[PDB]
Amino acid sequence: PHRYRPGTVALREIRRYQKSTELLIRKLPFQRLVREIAQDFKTDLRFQSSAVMALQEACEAYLVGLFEDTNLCAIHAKRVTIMPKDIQLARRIRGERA
Amino acid sequence: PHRYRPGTVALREIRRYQKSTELLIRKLPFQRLVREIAQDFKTDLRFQSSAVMALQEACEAYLVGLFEDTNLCAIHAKRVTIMPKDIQLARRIRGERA
Amino acid sequence: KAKSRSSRAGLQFPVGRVHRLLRKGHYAERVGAGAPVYLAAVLEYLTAEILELAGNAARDNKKTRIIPRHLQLAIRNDEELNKLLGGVTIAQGGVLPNIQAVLLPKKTSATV
Amino acid sequence: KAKSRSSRAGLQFPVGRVHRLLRKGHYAERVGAGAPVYLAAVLEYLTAEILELAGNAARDNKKTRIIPRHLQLAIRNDEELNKLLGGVTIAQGGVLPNIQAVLLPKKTSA
Amino acid sequence: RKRSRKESYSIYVYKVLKQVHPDTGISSKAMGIMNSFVNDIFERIAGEASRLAHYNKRSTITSREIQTAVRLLLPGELAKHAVSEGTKAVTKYTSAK
Amino acid sequence: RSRKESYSIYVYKVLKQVHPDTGISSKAMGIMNSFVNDIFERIAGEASRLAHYNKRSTITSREIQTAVRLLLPGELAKHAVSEGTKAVTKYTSAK
Amino acid sequence: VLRDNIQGITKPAIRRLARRGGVKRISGLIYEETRGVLKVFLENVIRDAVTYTEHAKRKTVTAMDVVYALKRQGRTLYGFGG
Amino acid sequence: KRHRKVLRDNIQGITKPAIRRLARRGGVKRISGLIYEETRGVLKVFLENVIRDAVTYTEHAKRKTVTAMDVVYALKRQGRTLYGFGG
DNA sequence: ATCAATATCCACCTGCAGATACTACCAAAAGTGTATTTGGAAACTGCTCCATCAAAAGGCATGTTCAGCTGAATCAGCTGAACATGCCTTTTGATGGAGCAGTTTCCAAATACACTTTTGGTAGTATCTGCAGGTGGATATTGAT
DNA sequence: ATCAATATCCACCTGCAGATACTACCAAAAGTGTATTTGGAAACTGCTCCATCAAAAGGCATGTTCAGCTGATTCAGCTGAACATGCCTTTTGATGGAGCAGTTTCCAAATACACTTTTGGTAGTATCTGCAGGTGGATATTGAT
Ligand SMILES: [Cl-]
Ligand SMILES: [Cl-]
Ligand SMILES: [Mn+2]
Ligand SMILES: [Mn+2]
Ligand SMILES: [Mn+2]
Ligand SMILES: [Mn+2]
Ligand SMILES: [Mn+2]
Ligand SMILES: [Mn+2]
Ligand SMILES: [Mn+2]
Ligand SMILES: [Mn+2]
Ligand SMILES: [Mn+2]
Ligand SMILES: [Mn+2]
Ligand SMILES: [Mn+2]
Ligand SMILES: [Mn+2]
């Protein structure tokens, strides 16, 4: 029986995904969450295919970026594990809140 | 011969300075640094005293602003003492060299 | 019977002015007669909201004259004005008194 | 008879269309004969610059067709293009392979 | 030779100040910040408006552009109130000719 | 069925001068178009401000230049400024 | 088996985004924290988009609506026009 | 003429005592020795980026005097909009 | 939990700097009210392309196991805070000079404008082919032993 | 070290999704010839920026001392990473109609014109008055013992 050690697949997933550009959230569940949030602003809305795809590209871009700055915040506190407090520090310093 | 313990006068100064709005950089040393840097861009320049003061206002505001973020980074690392690497983490996440 | 547009609209803020500045920046080929009324109102409205919160700060510091420090305490203490003016610096404004918790002394009993 | 302003200034970019867009962009009341030439040129140059580097990234990856992934690698690996576009996302760009040192495994006999 | 006329919003900010705080003055510095504030917000809106008109192939900025631009630029309760005070002053100005 | 103008003709011309045996996906072509519109607006806009700051009713090549100085980094700026000044000279020097 | 839409953004999806951002090791609390951030983003962006839609007198949110939104939210997106 | 006296090392006029006062306003309690040099550096970059733009406006206007408005237009461009000096 | 040093607070008191204020008043705005066009709301359709929906298909929710991470407790060295001492620089307030922004008048270039002549660029079409995976098998990396 | 279990690389193939290539027709560029507009060229202001310097407080530089913070160490227990499914959601593909967007119409509302009126910004003056900063003096706050 064979077993890769904690972090080894992780590093592998990093390399794999830093090499690709394909979106990483499944399309439908994103499309539902978009249509839901929008309903709170105007009812019976329709969404051009491209408009959702635009939103997803922006949205994933944003998060990937925030995970960089998060990971730099974790690392700063001599950790290798991102925690909420790290996402929090990044979004504070980015000017996004507090 | 009486002695305030390390960090009691510091806290006293935080209250003092956060309470005031006067500029904390001596005026003349700051005016020379402005003429020095400019001259190096273009010679024979003159500055409306208000142009020098506009710069000093922005600069102190920027620095005070940076120092808030820096302090956060220090604290994030479970320290109370700001270090270069805090200023750098702050300016990385701000996108001043991301 | 020259009757101010400002007065016609029920405003202090000068509609005539706001129509001329919209023309001179061009911003578009034509300016609707309602645009500079709506805008002069929104401007009046926002200056009012600030002056009320600033005056309050002035009164809170036992002053009769609003200075910059006052305006700053107003803009920064209001969640919605803060976000509007998030990327703006008020000369001679200072900062809000704010010391991180972890930095405060802890030489007393208190915690058992 | 009818010369192109493009061909006159010796540009691939359309000095006519740039002039029109400057008039009808509410940028000012009046637009000098030179501005839309100058601009057309500056857009051409910068287009040239990026395609160059991208072309090179498509060659680095054994490919003749430039894709977004090539434009991202071009821009984000050039110090001066990366600053200019620092506030821009490239759809289907991904990111530069980059793994913080401290996250790499111990390694060596020691 | 006669110094050129440099117009401000000072007259109007003062009228409004006395409306909200009849006994409260304002420093020439604070009145400075208050001028730059109006000038700033004026552009931000006029801008968004300028754009928005374009985005829909319209050559005319109307009170309908001004309003959308105000919903885009102002957060929550400032927007609601600013849109009221607008709509109101327009509805009045219309019926007040 | 109405004409949706782009810059994709002139991107493609400028591709073939620079990499005559290199192609471009539609998606890349879109990014390039966003790019040109983006920089167009950035320059036109800074030039608009400049004209207004100096009570000038006219955007000239001089505005486009200052603009390009302010918006472009160091080396990009120089090389755009040249490419511009050249194209203007070439256009003037053309009966 | 009804489940919230925000929970449609699954741990393995969030893990994948974190991986592209160079994250090795992920606290369990990240996934909710992340969904909350992702929600605020979309709110902030979609609100502005719809506001453009309603100005255009349309019931269909266009790519351009989103792009114009994303531009005034400082997140400018290349490849969807404009 | 007199030719102006030579300007050099003026960044050292941002004294250790002025940098602490600023950090205090930013609510800083303990300051490493290495901060003062780091801060001088950051300040110098900031000042350069602003003065460059400012002077770019001054030159565009064909003035030899940098105005308050040149600094304000520069600060606005850098996304550091300043109230209290005109515009 | 007492007490001593010293920082803090607060409430009056002057003499300004800066605010408010009386015009004077007048150049530039604002606005009044004709005479334009003319932008765009409105109504109608047609043809995209969007929501739905049911078959095809491949990720993810699930519990167990333990590797190794985080965070806790301890300690030592040394850094940075505080403070006393000596004194150099900046601040403050003039002055005289002049450099140079800021105004005002001619207009000769420079754009705008209205019309006409042509054509470059788009959008349908009509073909062509880069490469996205699929296979085979060789080799590298990892991890247990 | 060995040995293998699994991941990774590379060379080759090939159908087709998505390029490039081709065509015609028309919006919008360019040519022509008036019709406005502008932004230096010269010629003067007065302002305000520069420099200078003298006096003196006021803050800065420096050296000493040690409190307590940082960062190193060690460690136990906790918490995510790894790992395999079949079931459940997503994905894929095709149908009907919502609604975007193309188009013409026409009138309320916008621009342009050239008068008339009012205003707000000014320079000149006076004229008040909020509060800056200074003094006691009463009242916390801190830190040692
Ligand atoms: Cl209107
Ligand atoms: Cl020109
Ligand atoms: Mn009131
Ligand atoms: Mn029409
Ligand atoms: Mn040690
Ligand atoms: Mn001059
Ligand atoms: Mn042709
Ligand atoms: Mn392949
Ligand atoms: Mn092989
Ligand atoms: Mn000494
Ligand atoms: Mn253990
Ligand atoms: Mn229908
Ligand atoms: Mn008056
Ligand atoms: Mn006082």
Author numbering:
A (entry chain A), B (entry chain E): 38 to 135
C (entry chain C): 13 to 124
D (entry chain G): 13 to 122
E (entry chain D): 26 to 122
F (entry chain H): 28 to 122
G (entry chain B): 21 to 102
H (entry chain F): 16 to 102
Paste lines from the article.
DSB recognition by and activation of PARP1 is proceeded by actual phosphorylation of H2A.X13, which ultimately culminates in γH2A.X foci formation to induce a cascade repair response. Here, we produced γH2A.X using a hybrid chemical approach and assembled nucleosomes with either H2A, H2A.X, γH2A.X or mutants of H2A or H2A.X as the incorporated H2A variant. Additionally, enzymatic assays were performed to shed light on the catalytic parameters of PARylation.
In order to shed light on the basis for the variant-specific differences in PARP1 nucleosome association, we sought to obtain well-diffracting crystals with NCP, which required screening of different DNA constructs. The H2A.X variant primary structure differs mainly from that of H2A with respect to the C-terminal tail, after residue 120. The other histone fold substitution entails His (H2A.X) in place of Asn (H2A) at residue 38. This alteration impacts the H2A loop 1 (L1) and H2B C-terminal portion of helix 3 (α3) region, which coincides with the sole motif of interaction between the two dimers.
